[PDB]
Structure 1
Amino acid sequence: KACPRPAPVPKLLIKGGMEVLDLVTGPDSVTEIEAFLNPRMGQPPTPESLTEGGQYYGWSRGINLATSDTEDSPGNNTLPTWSMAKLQLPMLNEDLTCDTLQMWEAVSVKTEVVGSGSLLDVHGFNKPTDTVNTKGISTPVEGSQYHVFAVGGEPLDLQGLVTDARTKYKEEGVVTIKTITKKDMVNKDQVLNPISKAKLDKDGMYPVEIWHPDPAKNENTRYFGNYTGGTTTPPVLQFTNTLTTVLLDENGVGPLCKGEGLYLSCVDIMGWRVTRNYDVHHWRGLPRYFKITLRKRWVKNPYPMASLISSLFNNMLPQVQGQPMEGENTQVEEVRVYDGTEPVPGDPDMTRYVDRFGKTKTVFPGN
């Protein structure tokens, strides 16, 4: 009978992969999407054989140095790159009626880098502790580290700054300041090139050595991370399934996936692993989990129907090519407009204008 009623918890409709989304949800109906990005810095996945790719998978190949000040060309696997992806979500409803639509708005997100345990393997052939008698421990990952990530309703807006604008990045297989702005680098790039701005349109492509989350005066991504320089510097990490974070903005908004896609982006350098063959100081990274919580938000449609509707129907029309009733040489000498009916003026050649607000019996031309 009245066996006491358990606590009220939110009711899960269905779980499973992305398709679960497919299902009509309703309007408060939240979605939880766990996923993750694997750390793609250097050696790609494909050389599946642990011999041919030596399975440096998730490892900077070797570290390609430089000739000297004059020549510094890295390698395309001596280069850890910005890891990312986009989740494709369902489309929600409209109301051309009240010109308002709902979008996929992320709220919070738990994330976590996993595998910090892996850096407890201390056999294997790295430089030993005691080089001398060639003994000890095969030295753990150490060195500079960097973890940064973002979550957005559009790709990550970034900015390039580099150490030496002379680095011989390859035009091929990586996006460099050049690759984006055709022309070469300048000292400016090297510090804050307001030109050297790109988008995270690719993946495992723009290296982190260049591209940075640019605090564009504008953003629908939330991101963060940090640098920790150094050579021996100890790796440190956070194992926890306890904490969530708020993509919510200052007005209680979070991102909104324009283009029903959610965008995850991040980087997780732990530091250099070091061989014995030499100081082939190549570096490691770890994967990152993601638990995005997004709801359905009703928003004022931005751009007016007509515009789109009829912007299109005007783009349908035959393209005309013809004489200039525009630009710098309009064959149009003049235009007036009237609606009212004032009584006769005096000076018929009078003018009239309206400015940042109001209308005026233009000044008697006689200034």
Structure 2
Amino acid sequence: TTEIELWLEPRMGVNAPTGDRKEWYGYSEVIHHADGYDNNLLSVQMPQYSCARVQLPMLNTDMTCETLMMWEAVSCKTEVVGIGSLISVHLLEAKMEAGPNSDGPSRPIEGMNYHMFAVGGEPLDLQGIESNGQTKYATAIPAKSIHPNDIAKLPEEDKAQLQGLVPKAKAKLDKDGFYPVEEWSPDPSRNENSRYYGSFVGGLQTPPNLQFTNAVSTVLLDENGVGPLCKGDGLFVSCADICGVLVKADNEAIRYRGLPRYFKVTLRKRAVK
């Protein structure tokens, strides 16, 4: 038996409280309707998956032996923190929800809620897609994010295929704040050594629906009673928690809002062949 705790901070676009965008950590950069067509869509405008690898106590001195020991993740407790902050109606720079001569409340955080968490023994497998195959993305050296066609490398005239399923558009979630949610999803064709759980509610004004409790556990064992086996004695957790949007007052454009997620994974030892 053993237990592992850690926090995953949100990666909505502004992924660090530094630089010019310092004051909007935990948010995305402002997004307009023609972005990606009038201009190049920035990394800071695309909410990304969070990820982390935890080094577990190394179990095998000689890895050449036929019978080895491995950490097996049996269950997990996970929770999104800071949900109470979403009741705010005094949001900075946010649009007022009232008539022209009023002094009413600001728009609260509302809209798209995308929530996923994953526990596995190796990086999460991702499948790429594009809502618009010809969306213009900015490029920097080094790269601040990675998009499906950076791997599939289809000709520019063939990028409409990315609106369906491109088998070459696959990747591993091997870097935090690097894979945009709107382009990558957990790959159901793989992820045999991982468990992921996701839900999505669209719309711009949809009421956010979130729960939080410390009395619920997610069992990670499969039908055979075997959970994720941590290769290299590494535990891989990943998440994504878009909780809604903020509506700017001046031009009504939006930023996504994310919240931190907590993990407590319970592991046992298993002998493998």
Q: Is the TM-score greater than 0.5?
A: yes
* SS of match in other structure, 2:85: helix
Residue 171 of structure 1, CA deviation: 3.5
Alignment of 1:1-367 (within 5 A): 30-47=1-18, 52-66=20-34, 71=38, 73-93=40-60, 99-125=66-92, 126-172=94-140, 173-184=144-155, 186-300=159-273
When the two chains are superposed, the root-mean-square deviation of aligned CA atoms in Å is 2.0
8 Å CA contact 1:94–1:102 kept in 2: the answer is no
TM-score in terms of structure 2 length? 0.91
CA distance in structure 2 between the partners assigned to 1:124 and 1:270 by the alignment: 15
The code of the aligned residue for 2:21 comes to G
| Contact 2:91/2:108 (8 A) holds in 1 | no
Separation in structure 2 between the aligned mates of residue 130 and residue 98 of structure 1, nearest angstrom: 71
Q: Deviations over 1:270-320 (max 9, x none)?
A: 1111121221211101110101001111111xxxxxxxxxxxxxxxxxxxx
Q: Report deviation, 1:181.
A: 2.9
Q: 1:54 to 1:88 in 2, by over 3 A?
A: closer
**Structure 1 length as normaliser, TM-score?**
0.69
Give the length in aligned residue pairs.
267
Any conservation in 2 of the 1:129–1:138 contact (CA below 8 Å)?
Answer: yes
Q: Which has the higher contact order (CA 8 A, sep 6+)?
A: 2
Change (3 A) 1:131 1:280: farther
The one-letter code of the counterpart of 1:114 is V
CA contact (8 A) 1:65 1:74 kept: no
In structure 2, the CA distance between the partners of 1:144 and 1:255, relative to structure 1 (3 Å rule), is same
Structure 1 range deviating more: 217-226 or 106-115: 217-226
CA radius of gyration, larger in: 1
Q: Match of 2:243, SS?
A: strand
Between 103-112 and 276-285, the greater mean CA deviation after superposition: 276-285
Aligned letter for 1:111?
T
Whether the 8 Å CA contact 2:124–2:191 is kept in 1: the answer is: no
Cα gap change, 1:96/1:124 in structure 2, threshold over 3 Å: closer, same or farther? closer
Shift of 1:268: 0.3
Q: Which runs of 5+ in 1 are unaligned?
A: 1-29, 301-367
Identity %: 54
Look up the SS of the partner of 1:219 in the other structure: coil
Which letter maps to 1:32?
Answer: E
Q: Does the aligned pair in 2 maintain the 1:158–1:198 contact within 8 Å?
A: yes
Is the 1:142–1:273 Cα contact (8 Å) retained in structure 2? Answer: yes
Q: 1:279 to 1:251 in 2, by over 3 A?
A: same
Q: Is the 8 A contact 1:64 1:75 kept in 2?
A: no
